[PDB]
């Protein structure tokens, strides 16, 4: 794990019904824990489902952790790890993505597996009307021998409301590594830029480590 | 819709990292709401969790409906309907399923996607400690034009137990339809036979609607 590494990425999943891959390319700097991407729609364009809900499946070896802190990420190479996540929205829709993280060079690939179900047709992912997510507290706790993390998530609707999303988290280590105590990620999450239909989309990530 | 129809379907999915495809074949009699099939694990063998999550996402145009419920998705043939589903296990195992059924000819053709995630390593499904689902009631009911089910459901462990899952599921007709009112439909579902690691297997539902 090098002070700047490069990031590559495709992801395939299924929002109600509708298809789409989307790849990614962009750059990090693991010990700064921010990291820029670069995200192209090549299948499904246009997406009709509010493209925030994806934003937070395109590494958690991107966080810049304190010394007094375990780093689960950064230990796992090179080997590598994989997590698996459900988002269970407020209003019924429920999303499950995973990621294998794999590590050969001097980038960070990503395998990516995206599915979202029971969008209500009228709520503000189907109808297009989130404007961020706010930032939020990844609480992290060790169980049955591996790293899960938990969040309270909410997106800052078109209106000024907010739509709450519950994530839990189960990163999986591909080898033995030394444990961590409980302790939180803050995050600081972003789309900088985009193209009208977000089939051009340019993402940012600050993480923080730290203990309360 | 005859008084014999048969059934083919192709699954893919990933249940916690593992990739598996599984066909099947098989007939119903969507009038007496009863249907069988033979499924052959195609790719992923052996599967690592316990078939039992599955066999439900493996049609409620199989369900006898009596005079005074409209039925939803008799109806909606031939051009069709899909559904989605999430899957919350009390554990945390969350899944997410959909099916696309076609009608052509005779045959009921189904496409479908499931993705589990986030069941803990020594629980039920990843130690394959189930037995079956115990019989249940689904809820159905109209929401935003559309149809939805909700049933509590239960699968009996090993050890007389038993784990509870959460079912939620959006019906959507692919043309308008007479909308039913609150009713149920009862489920049996059973696994008549495998061979030893699940890559044969045959599954029979028995499902009736009434109104309590």
Same mark, same amino acid.
């Given at each position: ?10 992801? &395939? ?6 298809? $789409? ?27 009709? $489902? ?7 499946? $395109?590494?958690?070896? $991107?966080?810049?952790?304190?010394? /007094? ?68 507290? &990844? ?10 993390? !938990? ?34 990620? !803050? ?9 009208? /239909? ?6 940012? &990530? ?7």
């Amino acid at each position: 794990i090098k002070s700047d590494m490069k990031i590559k990425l495709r992801m &395939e999943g299924t929002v109600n019904g509708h298809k $789409f891959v989307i790849e990614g390319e962009g750059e990090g700097k693991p010990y700064e824990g921010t990291q820029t991407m670069n995200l192209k729609v090549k299948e499904g364009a246009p997406l009709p $489902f509010a493209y925030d809900i994806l934003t937070t499946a $395109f590494n958690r070896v $991107f966080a810049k952790y304190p010394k /007094d802190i375990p780093d689960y990420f950064k230990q796992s190479f090179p080997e590598g790890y994989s997590w698996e996540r459900s988002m269970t929205f407020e209003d019924g829709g429920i999303c499950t993505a995973r990621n294998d993280i794999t590590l050969e060079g001097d980038c960070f690939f990503n395998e990516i597996r995206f599915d979202g179900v029971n969008f209500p047709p009228n709520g503000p992912v189907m109808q297009k009307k989130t404007l961020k997510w706010e930032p939020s507290t &990844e609480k992290m706790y060790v169980r049955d021998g591996v790293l899960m993390g !938990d969040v309270n998530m909410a997106l800052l609707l078109e209106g000024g409301g907010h739509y709450r999303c519950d994530f839990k988290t189960t990163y999986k280590a591909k080898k033995g590594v030394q444990l961590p105590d409980y302790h939180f990620v !803050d995050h600081c999450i972003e789309i900088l830029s985009h193209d009208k /239909d977000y089939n051009n989309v340019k993402l940012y &990530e600050h993480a923080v480590a730290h203990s309360g």
